[PDB]
Design a protein around this ligand. Structure first.
Ligand SMILES: CCCCSc1nc(N)c2ncn([C@@H]3O[C@H](CO)[C@@H](O)[C@H]3O)c2n1
Ligand SMILES: Cc1ccc(Cn2cc(C(N)=O)ccc2=O)c(C)c1
Length: 318
């Protein structure tokens, strides 16, 4: 044991806990300045004792060297798309269809109802708790390695917050750019004669194709997780909402607008409410994703070619 290694371990633990409170709980327990004083204390100490620098330390999100290109990554499990609906009658038809297909239709049919984030789909792999690779969706089968870029995002933990992480856990989510960051970015890019962006979706996509993680780091990106790919060495909860609460409880940001709703009429009220709030969310959404909450019911329904039969994106009208 040495005093330096204890100081480093303690700063790292304290800072990851603060990042979790600030980014995931939106309830920081200390001011930003206190977080930063400990952050740059860690960073100086690490630099003064480099033999103790760890690759997943909070001070190590940003590679010092622009990449020369991105490698391809074929996903171990494909990333499917979503069927979509455009009206209440069409949503209701999707539900009656499930109601008829199911062998046994449960008393409430519970949906997990989520906003449809409008950014870029990603897959982020944690091995024994440590972020080791990230990919874009690409075409659903093959995407690109954006590990270095995903590491920069402030609300993505470099290590899961749990003493028992799964052997492997792949988090699936949307990376997107809130409006305030989007407006500061376009103001900055105009005042410096760089590519202005049409909408937050495009700013996020273009920020994630940056080969220089130093640039990506200055892009105000956030993850929200909405699913799980690989999950080895853990017993995943047996409802989708519970899996998202579990992701949240181990350090992964999840959107706070998500609700459980029983039966189509309640789901429709969720849709109307989200559609109302849309104006004042501080970020763009495309509509809602309504998912059958029970995992056994989802497995029973399966996939059509390559969207779930158990979910649908009910989009908003123009
Ligand atoms: C198998 C289900 C696939 C993911 S679930 C899911 N949930 C949400 N709450 C989502 N919000 C946005 N998306 C995007 O929509 C595309 C499918 O149109 C996906 O590639 C995602 O980029 C969502 N996807
Ligand atoms: C200078 C500075 C430092 C940190 C932050 C944001 N923030 C705050 C906390 C915090 N626990 O309160 C934790 C992580 C984090 O990213 C900002 C906006 C500016």
């Amino acid at each position: 044991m040495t005093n330096i290694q204890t100081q480093l371990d303690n700063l790292r633990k304290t800072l990851r806990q603060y990042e979790y409170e600030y980014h995931v709980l939106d309830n920081p327990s200390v001011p930003d300045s206190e977080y930063d004083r400990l952050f740059h204390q860690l960073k100086a100490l690490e630099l003064e004792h480099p033999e103790f620098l760890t690759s997943d330390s909070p001070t190590q999100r940003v590679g010092a060297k622009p990449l020369s290109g991105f490698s391809q990554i074929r996903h171990e499990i494909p990333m499917l798309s979503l069927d979509n609906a455009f009206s209440d009658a069409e949503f209701n038809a999707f539900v009656k269809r499930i109601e008829d297909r199911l062998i046994l239709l449960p008393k409430p049919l519970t949906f997990c109802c989520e906003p449809k984030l409008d950014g870029l789909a990603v897959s982020i792999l944690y091995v024994n708790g440590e972020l080791t690779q990230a990919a874009t969706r690409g075409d659903g089968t093959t995407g690109e390695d954006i590990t270095a870029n995903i590491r920069t995002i402030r609300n993505v933990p470099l290590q899961l917050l749990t003493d028992n992480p799964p052997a492997r856990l792949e988090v699936r989510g949307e990376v997107f750019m809130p409006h305030a960051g989007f407006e500061r970015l376009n103001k900055y890019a105009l005042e410096h004669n760089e590519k202005t962006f049409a909408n937050p979706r495009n700013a996020a996509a273009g920020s994630l194709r940056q080969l220089d993680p130093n640039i990506t780091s200055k892009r105000p990106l956030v993850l929200n997780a909405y699913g799980i790919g690989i999950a080895e060495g853990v017993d995943l909860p047996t409802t989708h909402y519970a899996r998202l609460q579990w992701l949240k409880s181990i350090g992964i940001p999840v959107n706070p607008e998500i609700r459980l709703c029983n039966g189509a009429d309640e789901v429709l009220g969720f849709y109307r409410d989200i559609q109302n709030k849309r104006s004042s969310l501080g970020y763009d959404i495309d509509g809602t994703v309504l998912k059958i909450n029970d995992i056994a019911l989802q497995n029973e329904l399966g996939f059509i070619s390559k969207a779930p039969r158990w979910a649908i994106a009910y989009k908003f009208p123009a």
